[PDB]
Amino acid sequence: PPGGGEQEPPPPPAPQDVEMKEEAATGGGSTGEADGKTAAAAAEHSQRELDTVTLEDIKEHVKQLEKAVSGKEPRFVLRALRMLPSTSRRLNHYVLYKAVQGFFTSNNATRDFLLPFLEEPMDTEADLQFRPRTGKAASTPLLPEVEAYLQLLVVIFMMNSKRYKEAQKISDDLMQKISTQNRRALDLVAAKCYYYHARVYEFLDKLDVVRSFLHARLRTATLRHDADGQATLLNLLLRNYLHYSLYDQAEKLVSKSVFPEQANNNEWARYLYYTGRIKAIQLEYSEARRTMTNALRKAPQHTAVGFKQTVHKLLIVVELLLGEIPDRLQFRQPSLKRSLMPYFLLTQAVRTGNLAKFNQVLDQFGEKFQADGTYTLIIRLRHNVIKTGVRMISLSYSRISLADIAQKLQLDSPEDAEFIVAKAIRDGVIEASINHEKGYVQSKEMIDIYSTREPQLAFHQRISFCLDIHNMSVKAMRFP
Amino acid sequence: MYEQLKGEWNRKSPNLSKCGEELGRLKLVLLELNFLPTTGTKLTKQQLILARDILEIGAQWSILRKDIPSFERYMAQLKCYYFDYKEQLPESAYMHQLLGLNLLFLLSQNRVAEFHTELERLPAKDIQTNVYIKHPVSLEQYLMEGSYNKVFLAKGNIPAESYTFFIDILLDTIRDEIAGCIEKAYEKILFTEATRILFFNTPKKMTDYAKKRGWVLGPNNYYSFASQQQKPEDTTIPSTELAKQVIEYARQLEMIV
Amino acid sequence: MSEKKQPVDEDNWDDDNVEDDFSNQLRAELEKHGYKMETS
Amino acid sequence: LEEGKAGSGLRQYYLSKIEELQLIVNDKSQNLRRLQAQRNELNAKVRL
Amino acid sequence: GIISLLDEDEPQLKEFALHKLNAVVNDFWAEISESVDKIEVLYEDEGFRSRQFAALVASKVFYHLGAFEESLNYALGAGDLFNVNDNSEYVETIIAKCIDHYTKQCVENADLPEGEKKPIDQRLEGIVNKM
Amino acid sequence: DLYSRYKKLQQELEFLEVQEEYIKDEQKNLKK
């Protein structure tokens, strides 16, 4: 109390003041923009939702004693807000109760009164007209309530709060979404409640119970129209079915719901991660690595974020399933130190023709390979141990004797050198050909890639994308 | 009820009459109640021991009788019974070779994409033990790099029954790949190239490809015809579609005024 | 902007292109690469 | 449910119907005022 | 995986499997897309009591696949097992399109008074006045 | 009200399809 207790009065009141006026001006601003000029995609909806991912998770973790978040429940226990006097009565109460919680002690939430902080705030004439207010101020008290992590009769405090909030969401979904479309708000609300309800089903039994309900929310999605609702629920529905290590992937191959068609640069980024995971395991290697490449370069705007460490981890494997390998560890992180040492020393052995070192890597770093969800490399990367050099030779040489290629690939027999090169050309490693008469493996024709109509194909791709930006820009620019 | 558990299976199974009685046994079990909810109830897991066992013996009968669509029919429902949601389920010791029947079968019909996505369900039985699952994945490893001959040499080593209905189709769908490599326009080889590339010093198989395909042994010489294309190209003949392709350029510049 | 996909997470300053090219090919480059001539 | 069965059967038919009919009119007024000012620029050219 | 049960050629195995279809058709959406060829048949197969209750599970999978007229004609062919229903998110949408199909039919029939009108199904107008 | 709102949305929708038409037509004819 003389050391830290004197610096206990400054942390409540300024987050009680100006952080309160954030959602007070936003929730006032989002409501009036839901009333008039209802197409508010170009408004404060997005960045406030970018804040609720980032800011309010690190603005507060505990329920903020001396009445900053512990005071939110005696603040919003009494909200009528129904008619224009009932709002202006409560606008006086927004002045009164915030002043009382800024001065003195209201109902102090000592981590236990959460269900009477879900009835009586929802009671005392709380509206479904302010269903964004009930939607936000039920999803935001998940975050002091989960991140306490004491988990002692709080799992049901999670469970009741989500079912209250989603029954409010269902009551929106059937009754009068008059020019509002709370799906923009309630998508990440459906996500954030079910990131941790997934975590609840990590501490306890399996989470196909989530997936049956998540089909039902996706069944009521896609029927109205798609405005990010199908997009957010699809990545959620895919994740457990990929997280389970059963068969599980032909369900996604038949999942013909491939189109969100616009995803605000962030759903589309990790959507391409999960479908790249799928196309890699069913041996469609070349299409997988190029959409893994598209996923890697789409959201790098982060700070050592860890899933960037994951997409970078898979992409080097699938290109080691194609022979080529780039520089990888040139952007070393405080966490990449753990993940560079296996895979750089892995491809060190892949480029060489060594195998007793390669099996030494497997015994050294099998636990991390099993932890990363990549058991399958040992059955599929031993293929490209011979396919790396034969692509390297057919890139270097032009007309090789197959007798000479056996010692150069240390194949220890000249007669099966027909068969590997037959496997290379039938699968399309190199466009070369064999003369089965005196040992020739001769290469392609002369390079003719300017006067043979091929520059027109790439030039048509760049027309069809660049002026497509032009037409999409002119429509999107002039709203007034 | 409790109908003919080991009647004509443990000694010998040449019969189709008990196959019709197993059909009647399928009528008795799938009219008991159901298998869909599986909430709790070890007492209704009691016939789930029975229902899986009688489809194990239906799977053994299916591969014994040389039947392709029905073997995958019973095996899918067996896999549906290892798709049990509430799986207390003490281990029926026939499971691993039962999967190895399916894992080898689905390799044989060239479902290689389905081959590797099935392998996800086993935590450590692929490597630590279980030669029944270790045999197809070591086999599929031999198909990867260059190793045709080790497949044909390690045919004669099976821990289980001989897997004969799988492996003969499995080798036959290797022979056509060697054929489809050697059916090119590369014109003539001799009978010793048939022994090296195709296989088999003097077989009935050289009579097989003499009557199926050509490859007739003339004056100690096989004649494979030219499989070479003609390539009739002008490639200015994309002139209409190229003139078309220019039009939607100027269209999409204009027309939105 | 988390995705909840986090949960886990000149010495060598510009060398890795040259290092991915050659690593250990008797880097002194003289005792065989220059000493061919006694073998010819 | 005197009205609860009537709200989801014969009013929800209307409430779902007038939703997108509001969304198009919300869309075209954005698109119209874009076309207005683009005519306002070119007419301000020619009269000058 | 009970589509393999629907291959097998006895009647009382069929409907038990396609009792299990509309039990979990909301959870196994796109796997039944390949079983479309089996049902669109079994519906044409007349002598079985597995045609209207097969037209239920047919109408569910074209509803997921967006084929809305396909769900419309097959919910007609679902008979009284569809017409008895009154409350779902499923049923109220395809009867809303049924009103849409009917009112664009009737205005089309109002365009030609000189005979020549269209043959109109009676289950679709039977749920018009039921509504 | 639930029917009268529905026709008023149609009448306005028919109208402001006409006004976006000729303005797109007038702006073409104004360039000449």
Curated annotation (Swiss-Prot), chain C:
GO annotation, cellular component aspect: cytosol; integrator complex; nucleoplasm; proteasome complex; proteasome regulatory particle, lid subcomplex; protein-containing complex
Keyword Nucleus: yes
CDD domains per UniProt: DSS1_Sem1 (cd13768)
One of the Pfam families matching this protein, by short name: DSS1_SEM1
Stored InterPro entries: DSS1_SEM1
Main location: nucleus
Tissue expression profile of the protein: Expressed in limb bud, craniofacial primordia and skin.
Keyword Nucleus assigned: yes
Family listed: Belongs to the DSS1/SEM1 family.
Protein name (Swiss-Prot/TrEMBL): 26S proteasome complex subunit SEM1
Organism: Homo sapiens (Human)
Gene (name only): SEM1
Curated annotation (Swiss-Prot), chain D:
Function: Component of the 26S proteasome, a multiprotein complex involved in the ATP-dependent degradation of ubiquitinated proteins. This complex plays a key role in the maintenance of protein homeostasis by removing misfolded or damaged proteins, which could impair cellular functions, and by removing proteins whose functions are no longer required. Therefore, the proteasome participates in numerous cellular processes, including cell cycle progression, apoptosis, or DNA damage repair.
Top-level taxon: Eukaryota
Signal sequence bounds: none
Entry coiled-coil feature ranges: none
Localization per record: Cytoplasm; Nucleus
Family according to the record: Belongs to the AAA ATPase family.
Native species: Homo sapiens (Human)
Designated name of the protein: 26S proteasome regulatory subunit 8
Subunit structure: Component of the 19S proteasome regulatory particle complex. The 26S proteasome consists of a 20S core particle (CP) and two 19S regulatory subunits (RP). The regulatory particle is made of a lid composed of 9 subunits, a base containing 6 ATPases including PSMC5 and few additional components. Component of a complex with USP49 and RUVBL1. Interacts with PRPF19. Interacts with TRIM5. Interacts with NDC80. Interacts with PAAF1. Interacts, in vitro, with the thyroid hormone receptor (in a thyroid hormone T3-dependent manner) and with retinoid X receptor (RXR). Interacts with ERCC6.
UniProtKB/Swiss-Prot annotation, chain E:
Function: Component of the 26S proteasome, a multiprotein complex involved in the ATP-dependent degradation of ubiquitinated proteins. This complex plays a key role in the maintenance of protein homeostasis by removing misfolded or damaged proteins, which could impair cellular functions, and by removing proteins whose functions are no longer required. Therefore, the proteasome participates in numerous cellular processes, including cell cycle progression, apoptosis, or DNA damage repair.
Subunit structure: Component of the 19S proteasome regulatory particle complex. The 26S proteasome consists of a 20S core particle (CP) and two 19S regulatory subunits (RP). The regulatory particle is made of a lid composed of 9 subunits, a base containing 6 ATPases and few additional components including PSMD1. Interacts with ADRM1. Interacts with ZFAND1.
Family the entry assigns: Belongs to the proteasome subunit S1 family.
Record-given protein name: 26S proteasome non-ATPase regulatory subunit 1
Species name: Homo sapiens (Human)
Protein's gene: PSMD1
Coverage span on the entire protein: 7 to 137 of 953
Swiss-Prot record, chain F:
Signal peptide as annotated in the record: none
Subcellular localization, as worded in the UniProt entry: Cytoplasm; Nucleus
Annotated family: Belongs to the AAA ATPase family.
Assembly with partners or alone: Component of the 19S proteasome regulatory particle complex. The 26S proteasome consists of a 20S core particle (CP) and two 19S regulatory subunits (RP). The regulatory particle is made of a lid composed of 9 subunits, a base containing 6 ATPases including PSMC4 and few additional components. Interacts with NR1I3. Interacts with PAAF1. Interacts with TRIM5. Interacts with ZFAND1.
Task performed by this protein: Component of the 26S proteasome, a multiprotein complex involved in the ATP-dependent degradation of ubiquitinated proteins. This complex plays a key role in the maintenance of protein homeostasis by removing misfolded or damaged proteins, which could impair cellular functions, and by removing proteins whose functions are no longer required. Therefore, the proteasome participates in numerous cellular processes, including cell cycle progression, apoptosis, or DNA damage repair.
Protein name according to UniProt: 26S proteasome regulatory subunit 6B
Residues of the full protein shown: 39 to 70 of 418
